[PDB]
Amino acid sequence: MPLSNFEHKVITECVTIVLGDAIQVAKCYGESVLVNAANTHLKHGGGIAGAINAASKGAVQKESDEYILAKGPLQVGDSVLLQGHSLAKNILHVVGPDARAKQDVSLLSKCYKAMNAYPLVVTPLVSAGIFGVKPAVSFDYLIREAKTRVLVVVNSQDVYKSLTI
Ligand SMILES: Nc1ncnc2c1ncn2[C@@H]1O[C@H](COP(=O)(O)OP(=O)(O)O)[C@@H](O)[C@H]1O
């Protein structure tokens, strides 16, 4: 019962909202895929990406740099499955839209659809931090697309209360 370690609320038979650190939730499930909310160049400086990279001792950034050098940068809405680096079975790097740049928020549908390839996914709310989309809106796109087991982890009690009220 890994979720007994965290306040959580089951929303549907697919989606559960969890209050905590997504990295610590994923650590509890060896078969989970952890979602990174990334940018087009996989530069993991801050936000959840910085935290995931630090937890990997910088290995995530090294792997990402090699990928981007070989393939070129990603487009908004793209996703790439990369190594898990002992944090999870794999890390799925998704490029959410940046609302500050007035990018198309509906591209979150593409980000969240990519999660359905995996039986168990631990994800933050993509675009809801640096990229300026409201948590409740990011959640709307997630719940519309989710067809697999998804633990949506939010690290703010204010957003947790807002989504579970
Ligand atoms: N370890 C974490 N676990 C869960 N949520 C996190 C974590 N770190 C940051 N967040 C929150 O996840 C959401 C997306 O964060 P962020 O890294 O800024 O991505 P984006 O650039 O897509 O907006 C934000 O609401 C953020 O505050």
Side-chain angles (χ1 to χ4, degrees):
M1 309 190 80
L3 288 187
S4 68
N5 289 291
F6 310 90
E7 192 158 352
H8 68 279
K9 182 178 192 192
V10 180
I11 310 300
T12 71
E13 82 286 350
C14 290
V15 173
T16 292
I17 305 178
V18 184
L19 173 58
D21 176 353
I23 299 164
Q24 302 184 180
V25 175
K27 183 203 182 293
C28 293
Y29 293 99
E31 283 305 298
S32 71
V33 168
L34 170 65
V35 169
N36 183 28
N39 54 53
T40 56
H41 289 67
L42 304 179
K43 203 172 193 53
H44 311 303
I48 194 178
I52 288 168
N53 182 51
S56 77
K57 315 180 172 44
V60 164
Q61 186 66 256
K62 285 193 219 165
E63 181 190 23
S64 293
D65 287 351
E66 293 184 28
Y67 178 89
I68 296 287
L69 190 61
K71 296 282 210 333
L74 299 162
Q75 303 285 120
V76 180
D78 279 355
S79 52
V80 60
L81 192 76
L82 291 177
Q83 286 180 236
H85 302 280
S86 306
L87 306 184
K89 166 187 202 73
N90 287 102
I91 295 161
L92 183 68
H93 300 264
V94 310
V95 182
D98 180 355
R100 304 168 301 175
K102 303 189 195 305
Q103 296 179 340
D104 191 351
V105 176
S106 63
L107 283 169
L108 280 174
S109 279
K110 269 194 89 166
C111 296
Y112 286 125
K113 282 183 201 284
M115 301 183 351
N116 289 325
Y118 315 100
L120 186 58
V121 173
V122 176
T123 186
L125 289 171
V126 175
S127 300
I130 290 149
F131 282 174
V133 174
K134 293 297 166 202
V137 169
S138 187
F139 185 79
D140 283 341
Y141 281 96
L142 193 159
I143 189 80
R144 185 177 303 134
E145 302 302 336
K147 313 172 183 162
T148 191
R149 287 183 289 147
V150 182
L151 308 181
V152 188
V153 189
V154 302
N155 68 346
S156 157
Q157 185 173 232
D158 283 337
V159 348
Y160 179 81
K161 284 171 121 154
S162 155
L163 296 176
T164 59
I165 195 43

